[PDB]
Ligand binder design. Structure first.
Ligand SMILES: [NH3+]Cc1ccccc1N1CCC(CO)CC1
Ligand SMILES: [NH3+]Cc1ccccc1N1CCC(CO)CC1
Ligand SMILES: [Cl-]
Ligand SMILES: [Cl-]
Ligand SMILES: [Cl-]
Ligand SMILES: [Cl-]
Ligand SMILES: [Cl-]
Ligand SMILES: [Cl-]
Ligand SMILES: [Mg+2]
Length: 341
């Protein structure tokens, strides 16, 4: 067990191992930047706020720790350390998570981007997604502010979806990248919702403009259906709510637009890929593994260097436990953590 030291920074007590120095507040928890003297990296240290206050919060704390401990891929955020100052389960109350400190996100770039930049950035998102989806994990919240990018144009996916009603209302970027079947609760969704988000991000890199900046859910749906067309009978059969089906059928029918006349002057191979991502019926969207083999990425695709994940057991999600049982499971995962090389 390392030696810990305590200090108050901006109304909160931080008790951390000596290896972490020069803590500086930066921003579910509070975050400080710090220098990790054991590894030489600048890191983000997050102190979770009230991690075990309710059953829902205790289970969410466990879910986040299990997910971050599993993610080991060049294009996905990983866990550098996790610690508690508690010496026993009986006094266990606080959880601290340590990751690499991220500078710019895709917004702080979306600069002057060549087609070669768009190829490389979208390739890396799909490479990370192939890995995430191979573990039957759905990210659910892909958008430019959840993508870290450095000076060398290298990219990492972060901030997995572990959002409320008010957060999704009105003219808000939190909703502009969401697939329509989850925005309006049409059906049980699956990993294909993430590919819809990649399509929205790719279109924005190519044009410099948000693809579907709706002023509310309904305005956004109208923008979407004007581009991709209104649904046919095949998709309508898959929407569970009779009211939602009734609303769809109240709209005048529209054909799918010509994407070459929307994305004027774009690489024809980029146009072709966008048509395969932005498909209304989620069953028919291209998958991440299929998209990596698309000719738009010929310059970067290497099927021997696009790895999949170890199997991931999510059976805990259907388990009904008490607060102190979720807390003990979390404690076990903190003390069994093994750092990366
Ligand atoms: N700067 C915008 C841009 C760059 C490249 C290709 C298309 C576009 N616009 C996208 C929106 C279109 C309106 O529907 C107008 C053109
Ligand atoms: N929001 C404008 C925009 C920005 C970039 C690229 C395409 C677009 N439109 C998206 C909406 C489409 C109809 O809804 C028309 C084209
Ligand atoms: Cl230490
Ligand atoms: Cl990382
Ligand atoms: Cl504690
Ligand atoms: Cl964003
Ligand atoms: Cl009609
Ligand atoms: Cl597992
Ligand atoms: Mg975020």
């Amino acid at each position: 067990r390392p030696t810990f030291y305590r200090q108050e920074l901006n109304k909160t007590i931080w008790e951390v191992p000596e290896r972490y120095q020069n803590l500086s507040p930066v921003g579910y928890g509070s975050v400080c930047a710090a220098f990790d003297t054991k590894t030489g990296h600048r890191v983000a240290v997050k102190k979770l706020s009230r991690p075990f206050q309710s059953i829902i919060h205790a289970k969410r704390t466990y879910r986040e720790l299990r997910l971050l401990k599993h993610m080991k891929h060049e294009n996905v955020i990983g866990l550098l350390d996790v610690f508690t100052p508690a010496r026993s389960l009986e006094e266990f109350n606080d959880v601290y998570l340590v990751t690499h400190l991220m500078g710019a996100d895709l917004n702080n770039i979306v600069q002057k981007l060549t087609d070669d930049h768009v190829q490389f950035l979208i390739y890396q998102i799909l490479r990370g997604l192939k890995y995430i989806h191979s573990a039957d994990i759905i990210h659910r919240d892909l958008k430019p502010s959840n993508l870290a990018v450095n000076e060398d144009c290298e990219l990492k996916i972060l901030d997995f979806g572990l959002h409320t009603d008010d957060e999704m209302t009105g003219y808000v970027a939190t909703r502009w990248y969401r697939a329509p079947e989850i925005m309006l609760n049409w059906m049980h969704y699956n990993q294909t919702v993430d590919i819809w988000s990649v399509g929205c991000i790719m279109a924005e890199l190519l044009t410099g403009r948000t693809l579907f900046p709706g002023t509310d859910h309904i305005d956004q749906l109208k923008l979407i259906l004007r581009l991709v067309g209104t649904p046919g009978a095949e998709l309508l059969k898959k929407i569970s709510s009779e009211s939602a089906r009734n609303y769809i059928q109240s709209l005048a029918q529209m054909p799918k637009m010509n994407f070459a006349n929307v994305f004027i002057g774009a690489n024809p191979l980029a146009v072709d890929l966008l048509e395969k991502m932005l498909v209304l019926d989620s069953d028919k969207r291209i998958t991440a593994a299929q998209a990596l083999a698309h000719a738009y990425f010929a310059q970067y695709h290497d099927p021997d260097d696009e790895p999949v994940a170890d199997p991931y057991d999510q059976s805990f999600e259907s388990r009904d436990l008490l607060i102190d049982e979720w807390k003990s499971l979390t404690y076990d995962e903190v003390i069994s953590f093994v750092p990366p090389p």
